[model samples]
Target chain A: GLLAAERAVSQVLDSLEEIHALTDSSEKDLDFLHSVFQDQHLHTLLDLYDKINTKS
Target chain B: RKQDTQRALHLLEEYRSKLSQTEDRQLRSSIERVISIFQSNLFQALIDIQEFYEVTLLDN
Candidate 1:
């Protein structure tokens, strides 16, 4: 099963759940912000977001 | 949670609307389950709304 939820928050934390996405934003470039505990995870998230952006 | 309850109600409403469009017995039964769950949970919320809004269930 796939779960998709859109949410926004003021503060950020380095966790899977803490990765914030702006739900109401019309522009794709300004929507998601990645929060990662490790540099490798940050790089992976950047790639993932880039792919999503490319697809969109 | 309030949001969960609200979401459930929203889905229940959608199911009910779809129920009116189709005549399948199995689908009607499924929609009835959704209706029952929504009404059961919403009963308390309705009571609270009645008290807060000063409107009885009998009032049109």
Candidate 2:
């Protein structure tokens, strides 16, 4: 019973991984990459960009 | 860096308290399991930054 549930979870994760890999090239332009980052890291990364441009 | 460090410490402390309250063997094991999983993910993110941003301290 539990084994079936575990298998299902694994299957879903594997499927998602495959899908992510297949779509990754075309989806690279999307901001979804940054969406995966935590809010704090996202802000820090954006601030880093801003500092680099504004200072230069 | 200071704020991120503080947030990381607070998150660890919260997990520590949760572990302290975990009495059952299964519960403790599960908590440890999740801790290991999340720690690996966290470390991977840190390593990714180290590689791309040339951040130090990941050498060890």
Candidate 3:
């Protein structure tokens, strides 16, 4: 269930990544938005998702 | 840009509430960290918006 949900949640994160490409002027503001989308623990979630899915 | 950050913050707040439905530590901590970072940006964004508005209001 979690592996599935991670994919779902990650779909939204993928959309957020597009914002990075959308603008170049307010790069400062982009950082602010991007940083929130990126947290250290988020990386951990991706890692766990990979590990758990592979095992399954 | 400010609008995007503000919008993202609201979306993150919703995620915060949704994650509360779980018992997973990883999701919990990650959501909180994301919220924390956005809050810092929103606070600064508010600062800029207010000062900019004040100047325009006073000048006009």
Candidate 4:
């Protein structure tokens, strides 16, 4: 949804949040960027960002 | 009419602009929903503007 760095960072966050999901760090993560970017293409990115950021 | 679309566009513009510009990620949970709403309004406003122009041109 943002920089290429953002895509890579979400992965890091998932491992970080691999346990508890809080309202904090959650938004900074790529998953929540859809609001700023505002594009379905980025929505896909956000979807991927969340699905992986939390890394099930 | 045209002015109505202008106002709506102005509304979403400020909402998105303000929301993003604000450093208040203190909650973080707020933006997803709030941005979604702001984005939706912005999208609809663009659509209205597009329609208004297209119809205006086609009628000529």
**RMSD in angstroms between candidate 1 and the native structure over all alpha carbons:** 20.9
Ranked by TM-score, the better of candidates 1 and 3 is 3
DockQ scores for all predicted structures: 0.01, 0.04, 0.05, 0.03
lDDT of 4 by residue, B14-54 (tens): 33334333443422223333233323434344345445344
Residue range A1-56, candidate 1, lDDT tens digits: 00101111111111112111212221221122221112232222223333443455
* DockQ-based class of model 1: incorrect
Candidates 2 and 4 compared: the better one by TM-score is: 2
Please give the lDDT score at residue B20 for candidate 1. 41
Best by DockQ: 3
Query: What lDDT would candidate 4 get against the real structure?
Result: 0.33
State TM-scores per candidate. Answer: 0.26, 0.23, 0.35, 0.21
| TM-score of predicted chain B versus true chain B for each candidate | 0.37, 0.34, 0.49, 0.32
Deviation of model 4 at A20, angstroms: 34
Cα lDDT tens digits, model 4, A1-56, are 23322432233223223212322333333333322333333334334334334453
* lDDT score at residue A20, model 2, on the 0-100 scale: 34
lDDT (tens digit, per residue) of candidate 2 on B1-60? 324433332333343344344343333333333233333334334434634574322221
Off by over 4 Å in 4: A1-36, B1-29, B32-60
Better of 1 and 4 by DockQ: 4
What global local distance difference test value does model 1 have? 0.30
